[PDB]
Every structure is written in C-alpha cells, then in structure tokens.
Amino acid sequence: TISCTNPKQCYPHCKKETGYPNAKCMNRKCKCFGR
C-alpha cells in the first residue's frame, strides 16, 4: 500500500501499475479502478 493524500498521486502510479490511472485516495489508502 502507498501513502497518498490526493488522487493525483495514485493517478499516474496506477496509470502504469494496472494501466488504469483512475485511482482514488483515502486516509493513507488508495483505491485504483482495477487493482
């Protein structure tokens, strides 16, 4: 798990991890659109 206080961080990180950049972020959490 990574630490992201904003979606702009999991946006690009997931844009390559799973290809889907659409990723949300929560209290020190990340919910991509297809983990």
UniProtKB/Swiss-Prot annotation:
Lineage of producing organism: Eukaryota, Metazoa, Ecdysozoa, Arthropoda, Chelicerata
Record localization: Secreted
Main location: secreted
Keywords assigned: Disulfide bond, Ion channel impairing toxin, Neurotoxin, Potassium channel impairing toxin, Secreted, Signal, Toxin, Voltage-gated potassium channel impairing toxin
Family: Belongs to the short scorpion toxin superfamily. Potassium channel inhibitor family. Alpha-KTx 07 subfamily.
Name of the featured protein: Potassium channel toxin alpha-KTx 7.1
Tissue: Expressed by the venom gland.
Entry text on domains: Has the structural arrangement of an alpha-helix connected to a beta-sheet by disulfide bonds (CSalpha/beta).
Keyword Membrane set for record: no
Site feature: Aromatic residue of the functional dyad: F33
KW Signal (keyword) present: yes
Site (Basic residue of the functional dyad) location in chain: K24
Any one GO molecular-function label of the UniProt entry: toxin activity
Physiological role: Potent inhibitor of the A-type voltage-gated potassium channels. Most potent inhibitor of Kv1.2/KCNA2 channels. Reversibly block the Shaker B potassium-channels (Kv1.1 sub-family).
GO cellular component terms attached to this protein's record: extracellular region
Organism: Pandinus imperator (Emperor scorpion)
Domain of life, per lineage: Eukaryota
Gene name of this polypeptide: PTX-1
